[PDB]
Amino acid sequence: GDQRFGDLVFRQLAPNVWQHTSYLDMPGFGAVASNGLIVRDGGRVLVVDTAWTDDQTAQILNWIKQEINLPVALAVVTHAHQDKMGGMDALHAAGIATYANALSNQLAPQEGMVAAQHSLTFAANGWVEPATAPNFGPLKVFYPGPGHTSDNITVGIDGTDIAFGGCLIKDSKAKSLGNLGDADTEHYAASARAFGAAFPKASMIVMSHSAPDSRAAITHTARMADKLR
Ligand SMILES: C[C@H](CS)C(=O)N1CCC(C(N)=O)CC1
Ligand SMILES: [Zn+2]
Ligand SMILES: [Zn+2]
């Protein structure tokens, strides 16, 4: 099922949704997979997260050209770490409009990232302010609160059973919450549960560092974060 395309992997999740996977060596972790999404919305394509590097991100765009052959209207990136924003320059070189949490754009320079062109802001309840996410189509963007990072955001795909937790959510058999160096241990558990409650009918939970899982990924991630506070 999985399509190897250069050094990346692509997996169809639904008629209009694919997971992109790219890898980077991290001493002490091995070659770490990071997952994002590609969504076809009618005559255009929407991307969630870059790959780790510009070169890998250009390869995502090459795959889109070969397998979908429609323009990429925008990309939204889910926090200011390299696995999610490392390929911003490749998107900009391709003329793609890019979006991130305002706080991700604020943090990007100190994190070694290039900021997105546009900043999303969020209501007190976590839902994106709609005027900051124009033309997002089926992408429903939700800020669950600080957790994996202060800026992490999540995305549901209307018309599917899919919600993307990014690096906030780990799989239902995961053993650790991963990189906690920028995390908010006090609010993580609540933020994970807020993601689940924002997308209550999503039965396929996509995440950055594990293959797609059931909603038990949310309950398990929350149950592990419950131990952090
Ligand atoms: C660069 C990314 C940003 S989230 C990172 O810190 N990682 C990769 C995932 C790894 C894991 N197994 O969770 C933890 C270390
Ligand atoms: Zn991260
Ligand atoms: Zn990550």
| Number of separate domains in the chain | 1
What technique determined this structure?
X-ray
Strand 118-120 to 8-14 pairing: unpaired
Using the structure block, give the residue that is written with the tokens 């008629």.
Answer: 15
Residues with CB under 5 A from ligand 3 (ion): 83, 167, 208
- Amino acid identity, position 127: W
Q: Which domain holds residue 40?
A: 3-227
Closest CA to 136 of 45, 3, 29, 211: 45
Residue 148 counted as an annotated binding residue = yes
**80 and 111 Cβ atoms separated by less than 8 Å:** yes
Closest CA to 97 of 67, 53, 135: 135
Residues 111, 112, 117, 121, Cα dihedral to 10°: 0
The protein residue whose alpha carbon is closest to atom 5 in ligand 1 is 179
Task: Determine the Cα–Cα distance for residues 75 and 65; give it in Å rounded to an integer.
Answer: 15
Task: Determine the Cα–Cα distance for residues 152 and 150; give it in Å rounded to an integer.
Answer: 6
The protein residue whose alpha carbon is closest to atom 7 in ligand 1 is 179
Residue 179 counted as an annotated binding residue = yes
Output the domain CATH number for residue 218. 3.60.15.10
What 8-state DSSP symbol labels residue 41? E
Q: Which atom of ligand 1 is nearest to the CA of 167?
A: 4
Task: Determine the Cα–Cα distance for residues 221 and 201; give it in Å rounded to an integer.
Answer: 18
Starting from the CA of residue 179, give the closest ligand.
1
Note the helical H segments in 40-166: 54-67, 82-85, 88-93, 102-111
Phi, psi of 160 (to 5 degrees): -135, 175
Query: Tokens standing for 176?
Result: 């650790």
Helix (H) or strand (E) holding 108, with range, is helix 102-111
Using the structure block, give the residue that is written with the tokens 């999540």.
Answer: 154
Residue 152 counted as an annotated binding residue = no
The resolution, in angstroms to one decimal, equals 1.3
- Amino acid identity, position 228: L
